[PDB]
Design a protein around this ligand. Structure first.
Ligand code: NA
Length: 520
C-alpha cells in the first residue's frame, strides 16, 4: 500500500471508485498503483470497460500501463479530448449559442416570473487614496473586452433563451460626488434590474465622498457571473488599473455552454442522472427542525445572521480528525452538521444542500460566468452508528456526488416531479458551506481598498438556514444565516454552541455512537 492521499479532483474520485469495485480493495487513493494493488491484465481491461460504461471515457490499455497510478491516469483524462465526452474545447463560431442550464432558469424566472433585483450581484468598496476616475473606467472597459460574459446579451431563438455575444459594447463609468451618508442610501437605490437584451450586464458608479475617499459601486446580473467570478473581476480590475498584462483565456463560457448541451445527449449524462434518480428514488425526507414561530404558508426571505468562533484548539483537533480518518475538514464538518440537524429534528435521514464551484477542470477556473452548482447531499445519521462510520458514509456519498456532479440541479428537480411546498425549497431546506477566509484589504499603489457597507447578503435568507464554516487564520468561525420568520437569535446562538459541543465530542472520541453524543 502506498501512503493514502484522498481524491483531489473529479477524475481522481471517479477512477478511485472504479478501482475499488474492480479490484475489491477499499480506500484507493491518489498515489495507489493498480498493479501494486494486485491488478493484472484481466482486471486492467475491466477498469477500461467500467470507465467506458459509466463515463464514456475510452482509456487505452497502453496508457493504464504507462500511467499506473490514480493521479497520473486522472491527469491523462484531464488533458485528453480524444474519446472523452467531458472535454470542453473551443467551439465553432455561430450566430447564437445555447444558454447553460443555470442561465436558462434565471432567464425564464427573470422574464416570466418577475424576479425584481433578486439576480443582482451588487458590491461596494471603500477606496481611500488618490484614485483616477478615468483609469477606473478604462480598467472596466478592458475587463469587458476580456470577458465574453460581460459582452453577452440574451434573446429567444427557436423558443429557447440563447446567448448573443457582442463584438464590442458601450460602457461608461457613472461618476457622482456625494456625502458619505448620501452614499449609504444611494448604494441601495442603485441596485436596479437589468434588461437582459442589452450588454454589458455590468454597471459601475464611482462616488466621491471626500478629498481622497471614494465608494465604488458595481452590479452585474447573475446570469453572466457568480461568487468566484466576482473575485476574479475584482483581482483583475486591480491588476488592470496598475497596467498589468493578464494571461490569455483558452476557454470561454459559451464553450462550456455548447459542451453542456452536447453532453446532455450522451450515455455519460444518463449515468450522471441515474445516480441522482437512484439516490432519491424512495421516500424523500422533509427536515423537521423545531421552529420558534409557525412556518409561514408562503416562503419568507427575511433573514439575520449570527457568528461564533470555534477556538484554536478545536479547529486544530478537527483538522487532525480529518487527517486521521482519511477525510477532508469539509467532510468532518458536514458530518457534524448532519448529527446536529438529526438531534434537533429527531430524524435519521437528512438532505443538506452543498454548493460547489462547478469549475471541475483547470480551464473553467479563470472564466467569468455562472458555474456554481448545488448538490443535494443525503445522509443517514442513525443513532446506532458510530460517528466514525457515519463520517465514512458522508465521505463516500460526497465522493459519489462529486463523481456525478455533471447533472444540473435544475434537471433533477424537474425529473423527480414534486413534493414541493411554497413554504420550503426543493430537496433541502438547509445549506452547508465551508470557505478559507479572504482579505479585508488587497491594496493599490496609491490607494487602500476595504468594505463600505456590512457586506454579503445576510438579511436575505433563501433557506430555513444556511450554515457557514469559515477558516479565519486564528480559528474556524461558525456562521448561521437564518429565516427571521422561524427562529429567534437566542435559538440560533444555542444551535451554534451545540454544533461546537458535537464537534468537541467527536474530536475527543470519533467512535462515539451518534445517540450517545451528549449535545444537551
Ligand atoms: Na466513491
Amino acid at each position: 500500500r502506498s501512503e493514502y492521499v484522498a481524491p483531489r479532483s473529479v477524475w481522481e474520485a471517479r477512477l478511485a471508485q472504479v478501482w475499488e469495485q474492480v479490484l475489491n480493495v477499499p480506500q484507493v487513493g491518489a498515489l495507489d498503483d493498480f498493479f501494486a494493488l494486485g491488478g493484472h491484465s484481466l482486471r486492467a481491461m475491466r477498469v477500461l470497460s467500467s470507465m467506458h460504461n459509466e463515463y464514456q471515457v475510452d482509456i487505452p490499455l497502453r496508457i493504464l500501463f504507462e500511467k499506473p497510478t490514480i493521479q497520473e491516469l486522472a491527469a491523462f483524462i484531464e488533458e485528453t479530448a480524444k474519446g472523452n465526452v467531458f472535454s470542453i474545447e473551443p467551439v465553432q463560431k455561430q450566430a447564437y449559442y445555447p444558454v447553460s442550464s443555470a442561465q436558462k432558469r434565471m432567464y425564464i424566472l427573470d422574464q416570466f416570473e418577475g424576479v425584481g433585483i433578486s439576480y443582482n450581484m451588487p458590491s461596494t468598496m471603500l477606496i481611500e487614496g488618490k484614485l483616477e476616475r478615468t483609469r477606473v473606467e478604462a480598467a472596466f472597459q478592458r475587463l469587458i473586452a476580456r470577458h465574453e460574459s460581460l459582452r453577452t446579451s440574451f434573446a429567444v431563438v427557436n423558443g429557447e433563451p440563447v446567448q448573443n455575444i457582442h463584438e464590442d459594447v458601450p460602457f461608461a463609468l457613472a461618476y457622482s460626488e456625494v456625502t458619505e451618508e448620501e452614499a449609504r442610501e444611494l448604494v441601495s437605490s442603485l441596485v436596479q434590474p437589468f434588461d437582459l437584451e442589452v450588454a454589458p450586464l455590468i454597471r459601475v458608479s464611482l462616488l466621491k465622498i471626500g478629498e481622497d475617499r471614494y465608494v465604488l459601486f458595481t452590479d452585474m446580473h447573475h446570469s453572466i457571473s457568480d461568487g468566484v467570478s466576482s473575485g476574479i473581476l475584482l483581482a483583475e480590475w486591480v491588476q488592470l488599473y496598475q497596467g498589468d498584462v493578464l494571461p490569455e483565456l483558452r476557454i470561454q463560457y459559451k464553450d462550456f455552454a455548447v459542451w453542456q448541451q452536447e453532453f446532455s445527449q450522451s450515455a455519460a449524462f444518463h449515468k450522471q442522472e441515474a445516480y441522482w434518480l437512484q439516490t432519491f428514488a424512495d421516500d424523500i425526507p422533509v427536515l423537521n427542525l423545531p421552529t420558534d414561530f409557525t412556518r409561514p404558508s408562503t416562503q419568507s426571505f427575511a433573514g439575520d445572521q449570527c457568528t461564533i468562533g470555534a477556538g484554536k484548539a478545536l479547529t486544530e483537533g478537527l483538522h487532525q480528525l480529518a487527517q486521521a480518518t482519511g477525510t477532508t475538514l469539509y467532510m468532518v464538518l458536514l458530518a457534524a452538521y448532519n448529527v446536529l440537524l438529526a438531534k434537533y429534528a429527531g430524524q435519521e435521514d437528512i438532505i443538506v444542500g452543498t454548493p460547489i464551484t462547478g469549475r471541475s477542470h483547470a480551464d473553467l477556473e479563470p472564466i467569468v460566468g455562472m458555474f456554481v452548482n448545488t448538490l443535494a447531499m443525503r445522509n443517514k445519521p442513525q443513532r446506532e452508528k458510530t460517528f466514525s462510520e457515519f463520517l465514512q458514509e458522508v465521505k463516500q456519498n460526497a465522493l459519489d456526488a462529486y463523481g456525478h456532479q455533471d447533472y444540473p440541479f435544475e434537471e433533477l428537480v424537474e425529473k423527480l416531479a414534486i413534493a414541493r411546498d411554497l413554504s420550503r425549497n426543493p430537496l433541502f431546506d438547509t445549506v452547508f458551506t465551508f470557505q478559507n477566509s479572504t482579505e479585508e484589504v488587497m491594496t493599490l499603489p496609491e490607494c487602500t481598498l476595504a468594505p463600505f457597507m456590512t457586506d454579503e447578503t445576510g438579511q436575505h435568507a433563501k433557506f430555513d438556514l444556511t450554515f457557514s464554516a469559515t477558516e479565519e487564520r486564528e480559528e474556524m468561525t461558525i456562521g448561521v444565516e437564518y429565516s427571521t420568520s422561524l427562529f429567534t437569535r437566542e435559538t440560533m446562538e444555542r444551535f451554534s454552541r451545540h454544533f461546537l459541543t458535537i464537534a468537541a465530542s467527536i474530536v475527543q472520541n470519533p467512535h462515539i455512537r451518534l445517540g450517545e453524543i451528549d449535545m444537551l
